Design a binder for this molecule. Structure first.
Ligand code: NA
Ligand code: NA
Ligand code: NA
Ligand code: NA
Ligand code: NA
Ligand code: NA
Ligand code: NA
Ligand code: NA
Ligand code: NA
Ligand code: NA
Ligand code: NA
Ligand code: NA
Ligand code: ZN
Ligand code: ZN
Ligand code: ZN
Lengths: 173, 168, 166
């Protein structure tokens, strides 16, 4: 579902997959090949949400922001895990937010970074590119390996392929 | 959406805002200007849920309770953050439950208290009023400042304004 | 709702309770008297999900799995708490996953085990039967008492009875 808020209707690319039970409200922009999964809520009322190209927002997640704080800005080929809370933060390209994590206002996650499952990235926290960061409050643990970087090169692209299988549902018996 | 459970139909004030995807079941009472957000579940089957005036229950949250344990009692002008799990506990007026927190059966949160995001308030835990409490397990950190009290004086009221802007 | 994915239709027992707002997709099998609560998502697209008999999956939870990793296999009379994330793991009979917990790929929870609320069981972790395990990352704390075993013997049964009252 797409809902209007004041003078704002969501701007959703024609190639974006939106699963059932989703609510996208107001000032939300979602780029090509991005894919939004079951029961996710993307609420752009008090502030804006922008999602780039080829990014997945997984099931039961919530995206929001705060009046007068940073907008929610998510780059390209990002993976946001199931049941995440993404709140007024910036996430760089190719990064992965582990399922069940919480990212608070004005935080920034560099590109090609893994946030471990169940992490809490607190307000204003700055996380560099190419690291593993995890815990509550989350801390930078180590640099990613070449294999982990390669995994991030393609994790979102596999979700794009998965979402195309759903977009062609009416082309399957 | 409201659902009957046995003999119980939800008692929702005429001015309560309820977003889409919400399921409110059974013995649930919600007061004037309270506002319930997308995909929240308020399940009053095994015990009662009561929410006062001007309280927000944010998106993807779950409110439930347990047999023979404490009902869920939430006061006025309370903020319950996104994806919280609120279970058989008492929450005093003007308090804020940080997003993604879990509050277990028989816990009590005093009035004018902030629970930090991602906290776990354990069973039977009593958190005093006018403090910041955070962590898993959650611990009292310090008393709130008057600026934080003033924030709590208005956080729920700004949510009321927000809900009215949807023009339901 | 039971959504088809490619050639996979969910196989749901006639006695399985499924609440409103639920999305069950693809290669998902759910057995007799199991009960799936409001807004839960059970997504069997990249891998399968199997749930036995008398098991509850509570509100706002998500079950999923990963390509090339272990399927999600949940036994009989299991309790999965509200807003849990259950991912490519095996859960033994009569176990209880405390609300808001996360179980990652290839983990195994032994039967008659309690995972404390808000816990994280990491990938490939094998939790023995008949213990309490809690924390993030979760650790085994102690063996369960007879009182707690009795509680696990009745927890899912109470959810079966609750679901039938709907
Ligand atoms: Na719509
Ligand atoms: Na829904
Ligand atoms: Na959640
Ligand atoms: Na790891
Ligand atoms: Na993607
Ligand atoms: Na609505
Ligand atoms: Na909050
Ligand atoms: Na509890
Ligand atoms: Na096919
Ligand atoms: Na714990
Ligand atoms: Na730890
Ligand atoms: Na059950
Ligand atoms: Zn918010
Ligand atoms: Zn419950
Ligand atoms: Zn997954």
């Amino acid at each position: 579902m797409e809902h209007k808020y004041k003078n704002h209707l969501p701007k959703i690319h024609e190639t974006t997959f939106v699963a059932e039970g989703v609510h996208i409200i107001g000032d939300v922009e979602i780029g090509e090949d991005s894919n939004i999964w079951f029961n996710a809520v993307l609420r752009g009322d008090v502030n804006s949400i922008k999602i780039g190209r080829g990014t997945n927002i997984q099931d039961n997640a919530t995206l929001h922001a705060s009046t007068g704080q940073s907008p929610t800005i998510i780059g390209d080929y990002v993976t946001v895990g199931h049941n995440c809370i993404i709140h007024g933060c910036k996430i760089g390209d190719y990064s992965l937010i582990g399922m069940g994590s919480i990212i608070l206002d004005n935080a920034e996650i560099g590109e090609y970074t893994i946030i471990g499952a169940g992490s809490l990235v607190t307000q204003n926290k700055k996380i560099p590119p190419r690291v593993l960061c995890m815990g509550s409050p989350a801390k930078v643990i180590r640099e990613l390996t070449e294999e982990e970087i390669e995994y991030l090169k393609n994790s979102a692209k596999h979700y794009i392929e998965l979402s195309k299988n759903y977009r062609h549902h009416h082309h399957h018996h």
